[PDB]
Amino acid sequence: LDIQMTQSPSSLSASLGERVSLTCRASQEISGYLYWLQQKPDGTIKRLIYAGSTLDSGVPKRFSGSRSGSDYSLTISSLESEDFADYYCLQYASYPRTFGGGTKVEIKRTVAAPSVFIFPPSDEQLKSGTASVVCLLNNFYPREAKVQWKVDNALQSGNSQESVTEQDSKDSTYSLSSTLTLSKADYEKHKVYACEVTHQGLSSPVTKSFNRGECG
């Protein structure tokens, strides 16, 4: 029968400095042939532990691995910001090789209000028919934020998209872009472009705006 590796929890949020442990239960005997890897947001995968408790030579000592019967554990003695990643176990006792479903390790940190920046479309882009106005929310925590666009004081709908980065490896914050896409004609016909941001870190909404007529 294929060996099932049941990994828990599937998501773990933890304060900096916290000792955290991840568990992987093998459905059959793997005799210590259990491997743990880390995958960072950029997709890089590296070996952490093999043979259940042997630490790869390039991994910091805060990582260790242990076995208790059919339970295998990966423990970080005190969590660092750079440990934000997805962790997976994998058994190599037999084939097919099988993986745990992974654990996304999220970092809890203090509230940080975003810095808000706005960028008008470049004249280069305008020459091509479309206009993108970009609002950047930088280095904030927690992740919940609301961004609204107003063009000459009228709320926009349907013409913007957001993208958000994964928690930062050094300071555990997020950043977010909200891009408003308009035709060049619509952009030239209106004047005031405002990005309105609401976040727990801010007492009242912050609005950053520019007037097309003046540049940035």
Partner: protein, 217 residues
């Protein structure tokens, strides 16, 4: 410690794709190559191994025989071919190498395969110029908007890799047009703006596009 893998590839449904994995250093030791699939934002699935020493191979039955592994022991290169493709095969494929007593010691960076009927399109790169509207007190934000390309991925560096701190390159978003777009931003000191140049280096290998865009205030 470096396994090299072939670049991202766009292939049409019903076709096939073949990617490679090789050790960067001339070695001569006997390695086993393990191959792993990862769909966007999902987990890991084992595909199979190839042992170039004796041609040994084994496959996860979940692939229904669609995957074939081969090798050229002369160059210590392993190849994974996938046939009868469909969009379920759009994924990043990884290789890892194992030795005697040294399981999965090294991983490659992965190869991004997109199975689609759509044509490749290179990006347009536009500046996100620093101004009073993107300057705090002493810190200015600037960036590049990488618009309208297909398929993923694009890569973005700043000042040929000399500028890494404070860089945030956003995940791509699929536009209604079926093309992707993303922005890469960076915060730098405002006082550096009249003297330090800022250039975003963008590469989109599927369309063989490389552009270096200078971002001026």
């Amino acid at each position: 410690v470096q396994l090299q893998q072939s670049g991202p590839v766009l292939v049409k449904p019903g076709g096939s794709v073949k990617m490679s994995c090789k050790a960067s250093e001339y070695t001569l030791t006997s390695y086993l190559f393990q191959w792993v699939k990862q769909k966007s934002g999902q987990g890991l699935e084992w595909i199979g191994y190839i042992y170039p020493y004796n041609g040994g191979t084994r496959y996860n039955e979940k692939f229904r025989g669609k995957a074939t592994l081969t090798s050229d022991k002369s160059s210590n290169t392993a190849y994974l071919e996938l046939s009868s493709l469909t969009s379920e095969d759009s994924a990043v494929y990884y290789c890892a190498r194992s030795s005697m007593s040294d399981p999965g010691a090294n991983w490659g960076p992965g190869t991004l395969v997109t199975v689609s009927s759509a044509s490749t399109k290179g990006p347009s790169v536009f500046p996100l110029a620093p101004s009073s509207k993107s300057t705090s007190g002493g810190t200015a934000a600037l960036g590049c908007l990488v618009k309208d390309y297909f398929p993923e991925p694009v890569t973005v560096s700043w000042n040929s890799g000399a500028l890494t701190s404070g860089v945030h390159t956003f995940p791509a978003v699929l536009q209604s047009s079926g093309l992707y777009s993303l922005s890469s931003v960076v915060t730098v000191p405002s006082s550096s703006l009249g003297t330090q140049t800022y250039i975003c280096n963008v590469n989109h290998k599927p369309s063989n596009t490389k552009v270096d865009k200078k971002v001026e205030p």
